[PDB]
Design a binder for these strands. Structure first.
Lengths: 92, 16, 91
DNA sequence: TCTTATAAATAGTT
DNA sequence: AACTATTTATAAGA
């Protein structure tokens, strides 16, 4: 971007909405690429700060949610804290 | 995912 | 990257797994940033080619799924085909 | 909305 | 596992 920003809450209502819209699309674009390159089925659910709902699924949201509910094994499961942990460990 | 009451709530929503 | 690639299925099992791991993390990192910058709650569910499950949620997957079920109003809903269409338009 | 200067992610090689 | 040149994403401007 024209200037580097720190990862922290945006206070200006207007900047927040603008950044939300652009980054949401950027997230969905990256999901699209992953699903095609690597043959994945992906669903994304986003609630904004007012709790409005936006959703993406590579093909069909219902099917992925149904598969999620059926899944029995333990699996990789991450939160913000896992991501932050990974970044403290990475050098790049 | 495996078991639960959330598993139940999600399944029903999807099925109705 | 060193080269532009076409967005099409990678057949080399090894290249696929390397790409999968790096891009999955890239997706979760961007989710993390969006959730903090714009004060929102995000969940991501991924089934790989072997049907193994990977999941991310900014705070709590249960709560997002519970909230999802309670939503009934119309909302933005996109698929790969919408994204492809957008990219046609962007040029 | 676009655009463009800059920052961030990633392909290909090691 | 690493590095790095390049492609891609995006912050601030139009």
């Amino acid at each position: 971007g024209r200037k580097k920003i720190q990862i922290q809450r945006i206070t200006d209502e207007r900047n927040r909405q603008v950044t939300f819209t652009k980054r949401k699309f950027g997230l969905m674009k990256k999901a699209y690429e992953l699903s095609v390159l690597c043959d994945c089925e992906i669903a994304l659910i986003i609630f904004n700060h007012s709790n409005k709902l936006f959703q993406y699924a590579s093909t069909d949201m219902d099917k992925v949610l149904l598969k999620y509910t059926e899944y029995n094994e333990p699996h990789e499961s991450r939160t913000n804290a896992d991501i932050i942990e990974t970044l403290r460990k990475k050098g790049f | 995912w495996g078991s639960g009451e959330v598993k139940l709530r999600l399944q029903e929503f999807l099925l109705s």
